[PDB]
Ligand binder design. Structure first.
Ligand SMILES: [Cl-]
Ligand SMILES: [Cl-]
Ligand SMILES: [Cl-]
Lengths: 275, 463, 263, 459
């Protein structure tokens, strides 16, 4: 009689708990950092002078006439863009772990440029969107990347060409977060589209809509796993930065996924379909 | 890093009834404090056709509507009608004399105007006049439904600051009226003009009924439930501070405050012009203007409430400048409010955790990241037996200022509870806490009200 | 006296232009819809829910992004020759996208600096472009791979309305890539050596080549993508009553510095 | 499109002498209005070395300096000395006790400050204190030379091949209340330092002598020559943006007479068109600024100009045109013009040859005039530059009385007003050139503080 009152019943989370991975890597910085003054206001201004010398590198920062780098600038063409009498090696803590917004910004820029140089075998960097994407090798050609997921060897088609023409590249925003007195790299996966592996796609918005279909838990988690492998391996003249995975996060209650796969008419929607 | 999974926050309903779900809670207990003979007089503006459509929809709602998805009945409940199982314990009636039509000629006059901004101003002019008349006359509506015909919604609303937004301008031009408006699509009765329309717009009827009636109930000034507090003595007030940018003049930014109580009622203040860090971007307040805004807000709160709060929590989506923390501290000190907290709510953090499987982590998952707090306000919801969305949820990152009295665990539970204050829907898994969510809605309206003109603090006018 | 060329081409616009309303605020919002339909082209504008183009939008996949009932052919002068800022903006956007479409064989367009440049064909490969200077067949190495950085001949193509006509303005420059396609990560090094090429004869020569390309782009050829709807015309030389006594080559010790040296 | 090649504008020098060239003119005729026993007292701030260096240069200048390029003699002339062939008919002397020295230790104190902005403020504090001492004591300099040692210049001035304080702009703002202008020089070559970025690593001596003395002459308040034409004033209206606060823009006016003297005024904050950009004035604020400018001119000159030409580098908004008209009406000014001077037009003409078109080349496009302020110069027998010159595009407003041909000639003539050098082929007309210079200084003077109208203090 009338409209039935539901009891408001539901299956609770499992009390056994479960684990989750976080998309951070701990960064191990060199113990010392080099600082100096420069005649150049910013790094862009110093580039023409820098490239007059050989063995060019760009993992350095000049802002407000101040230079920073992890490498010794006296041993590279940077020796032309600094005031040499002011070059000093100091405890990295004095630049990377203080309260000055300017040192914080210069630290993050140096970390970002260091990662770019360290990963250049696999990755290309776009100034727009600050996006790091797997680079194509060959025009209109797909390629795969092999990597370890726990104890299992796996692979992904990180550059994927389609023709009736566009090419999709696995991508990530790599951000930096300081938590207490440690720096972390944050992996936020995305995709980048080109027409042929190289030329940026003239109108992303068509393709932007297909990315959303892929934003599903298992697919994003797999991509995090793959980037953590790339970046950890990148740190093994030695690479300047090493990266360390964090222990899993333990959650006291678990999603009841196996029950829901049975009861939830929308279960299949939670899984990415790559069209 | 230590993780928690918070309980879904409990709401309190009529006679001290508690439930996590607004819809089940209202059916079990009714709203927070009904009075015998409660009635909400609903005025209507539409065409002959859409007004008739609204009449039929209200009648159908009154009889009740069956769920269109019985396999997920908690998320898709039946609407129990407005008779002996009325969950609002309130009549919703369109009185005779309280309907205004838009004629065929007026529709054609608007659609016929080729320039978008011209067409929008003509529409706002006409409708704001019709609203003023309905409010000024003898019909005495508590809330007005604007049900425009589909071709007029198609003209006024773009599909998916160059161009006028019809809704935002209308709300601005009607901000001085005490009777709020609910703008609806006349076929399905969901909200129109708040977001872009779908070019191919083409069951969830009981949900649409729940949502429209809940919206009208809030707009009539009635409270369906309150956040259940830890202590019945320890009242907390929640103040968001936001900024919006003017399009005219020098494009200066203006501060705003959104001051909420545990019953989900909001007070809206406009404060001083903001300073900016660099090239007219990154707005912030000086110590003096931050103090003044918090003093203004506390004053408004006291004017509308019996009890002074024991705790005030201030939320801002950008970091607290030292000068802001200084001025807020100065206003708090002088207020004599015992406890206070300042929390930066990052809405765009890249940090996330990922369980192993296809469903995302539960709503209420929290990770304490050494003084930063990662909180999933969206995610798998046990009550609903699913994750109600599609795209993976991205959590909030909460950064409590060192000036705060509470722990990051207490402040995260507060944020999660504030997500349940919801004027848009009866589904409780919203991403943003009400004071932050309110900032963007009020900013889009207030940019159309000249700086220095007094604006109403009654948040219902902005919804 | 002597004669000088001006870096303008007169633009010949169709007598009619199509206007409509659109459900979409701007062209970028319409793209996902437009490409779902096919028979696509991009030489059109939507801005503030108004659509403009020279082609009839009913005849292409653009039919999905206009309000069909409102499509109207109107006298070009109503959009292209008034003092309404919005109309002058939309006109320049339509001209630019038309040029883009008409020159797609040779040129790529860069959003940044609104720069056109000769596109590469092979990765890390050089190519030449054959054109007419006066009545003489010539060639320019418009893509030059140095072995690694690639320089592409480029130009800022701008629009100027003088009295009651439209003109395309050719402002030559150079674009640098790593491979022929990927923009140069740090291009300040190379930009520096563009300045050495900023000399009268070298720039004049570039004006000439660009003129050729743009005039040709508007040519209707028998037995040859839709035909172009815009044409371009060279202007008469400018007549100067007083001439530079260049034959200074004797007396000025800096005469040679006036000629460009490409390195 | 009709072209015209203007004649190089004529200047008037002493006793009715006329010449196109500031240098040849002064050589033959002397300056506009000399008085017997004219002397400029030059104060000096530097180190023991630079002060000694500068006093030798001054002495050497007096004896005369030979051209180091007789193949281009008009371009590279001889400086004929400060005796019987003195082009300035003026003595230039450093009086006793008009010298202040910076110690080697003071230099090291600045160059060793590691943060650029701290170094700059420290240098500014130190030097502005020495300037104040010099002005407030008994030496009575007319003009002060600041000859900083090379290492201090290298510290203070950024190298090239809003993020940071500019030493010269900040020093000038901090000293704008002083009535004795400063000239900042490199102590090796005596050319201008700190106006522009320096080269990463550091002979036209007679030209250097001409340029320095001409600058001191102007800063000492003396007039070398007048533009040969009732009196016309030329008022530039510009805008600069503040770095702090809300980064508002402020209007400025730079009003020049035909003797090349400038009066500088600060007006209301500007409105902007979009997202803090495209500054413009409302009608009333435009009227106020022009009324303020005419008031300053009248207060000095006890007359009002018969013709006012107003120049801007952005289009005149209708509100701006309205306010300017209202101001002219109230000031009873009879004839006026409004010209938008486009500095970055892509329109250009190309002769057949290696040399560019002649300076003074003008093309009337319909309603807009292409003008070459830089290009091949017959008098110099070359094009003095390297990169091909890009012309100005002049757009007269419909509210103007004069024709575009008359207006273009005025713009060309205004390029000869030159407080920087004695070479006359300048790209911009003085009222426009002054806008950027004054804006860079005034952004360091808090809005609301009244500033001197004396343009010499901003040069
Ligand atoms: Cl970079
Ligand atoms: Cl701060
Ligand atoms: Cl585009």
């Amino acid at each position: 009689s009338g409209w039935e009152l539901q009891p408001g019943v539901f299956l609770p989370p499992l009390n056994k708990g479960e684990d989750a991975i976080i998309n951070l890597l701990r960064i191990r910085l060199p113990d010392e950092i080099f600082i100096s003054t420069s005649p150049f206001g910013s790094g862009r201004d110093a580039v023409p002078e820098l490239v007059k010398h050989g063995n060019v590198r760009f993992d350095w920062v000049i802002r407000k006439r101040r230079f920073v780098s992890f490498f010794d600038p006296r041993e590279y063409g940077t020796r032309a863009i600094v005031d040499l009498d002011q070059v000093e090696a100091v405890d990295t803590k004095l630049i990377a772990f203080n309260d000055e917004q300017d040192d914080l910004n210069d630290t993050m820029d140096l970390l970002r440029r260091t990662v770019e140089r360290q990963t250049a075998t696999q990755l290309s960097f776009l100034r727009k969107d600050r996006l790091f994407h797997f680079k194509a090798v060959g025009v209109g050609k797909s390629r795969s990347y092999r990597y370890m997921s726990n104890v299992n060897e796996t692979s992904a088609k990180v550059v994927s060409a389609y023709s009736s023409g566009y090419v999709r590249h696995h991508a990530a925003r790599l951000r930096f977060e300081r938590l207490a007195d440690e720096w972390f790299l944050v992996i936020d996966p995305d995709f980048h589209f080109t027409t042929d592996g190289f030329q940026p796609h003239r109108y992303p918005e068509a393709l932007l809509a297909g990315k959303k279909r892929l934003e599903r838990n298992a697919a994003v988690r797999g991509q995090v796993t793959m980037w953590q492998h790339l970046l950890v391996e990148s740190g093994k003249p030695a690479p300047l930065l090493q990266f360390e995975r964090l222990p899993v996060i333990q959650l006291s209650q678990a999603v009841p996924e196996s029950s829901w796969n049975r009861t939830d008419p929308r279960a299949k929607e939670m899984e990415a379909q790559d069209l | 890093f230590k993780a928690h999974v918070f309980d879904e926050p409990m709401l309190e309903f009529g006679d001290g009834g508690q439930h996590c779900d607004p819809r089940q809670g209202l059916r079990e207990h009714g709203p927070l404090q009904p009075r015998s003979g409660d009635v909400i007089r609903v005025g209507v503006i539409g065409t002959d056709d859409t007004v008739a459509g609204f009449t039929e929809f209200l009648a159908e709602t009154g009889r009740g509507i069956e769920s269109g998805n019985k396999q997920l009945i908690n998320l898709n409940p039946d609407f129990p009608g407005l008779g002996n199982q009325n969950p609002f314990r309130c009549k919703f009636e369109v009185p005779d004399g309280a309907t205004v039509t838009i004629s065929r000629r007026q529709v054609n006059d608007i659609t016929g105007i080729g320039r978008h901004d011209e067409a929008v101003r003509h529409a706002v002019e006409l409708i704001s006049s019709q609203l003023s008349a309905l409010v000024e006359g003898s019909a005495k509506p508590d809330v007005i439904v604007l049900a425009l015909p589909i071709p007029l919604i198609e003209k006024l609303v773009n599909a998916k600051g160059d161009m006028l937004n019809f809704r935002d301008l209308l709300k601005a031009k009607t901000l001085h009226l005490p009777v709020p408006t609910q703008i609806v699509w006349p076929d399905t009765w969901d909200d129109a003009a708040k977001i872009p329309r779908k070019i191919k717009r083409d069951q969830v009827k009981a949900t649409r009924a729940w949502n429209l009636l809940n919206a009208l109930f809030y707009k009539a000034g009635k409270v369906p439930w309150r956040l259940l507090p830890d202590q019945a003595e320890y009242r907390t007030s929640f103040l968001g501070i936001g900024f919006y940018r003017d399009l005219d003049g020098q494009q200066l930014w203006t501060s705003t405050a959104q001051m909420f109580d545990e019953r989900g009622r909001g007070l809206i203040l406009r404060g001083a012009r903001a300073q900016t860090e660099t090239r007219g971007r990154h707005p912030y307040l000086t110590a003096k203007d931050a103090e003044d805004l918090v003093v203004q807000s506390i004053a408004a709160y006291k004017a509308h409430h019996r009890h002074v709060p024991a705790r005030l929590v201030v939320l801002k989506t950008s970091r607290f400048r030292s000068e802001e923390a200084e001025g807020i501290d100065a206003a708090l000190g002088k207020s004599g409010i015992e406890m206070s907290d300042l929390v930066w709510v990052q809405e765009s953090s890249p940090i996330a955790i990922f369980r192993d499987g296809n469903y995302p982590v539960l709503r209420g998952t929290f990770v304490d990241l050494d003084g930063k707090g990662l909180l999933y306000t969206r995610g798998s919801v046990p009550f609903y037996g699913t994750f109600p969305g599609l795209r993976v949820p991205r959590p909030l990152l909460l950064v409590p200022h060192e000036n705060s009295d509470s722990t990051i665990l207490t402040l995260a539970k507060d944020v999660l509870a504030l997500t349940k204050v919801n004027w848009n829907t009866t589904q409780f898994d919203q991403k943003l806490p009400a004071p932050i969510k309110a900032a963007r809605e009020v900013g889009r309206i207030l940019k159309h009200v000249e700086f220095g003109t007094a604006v109403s603090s009654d948040f219902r006018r902005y919804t």
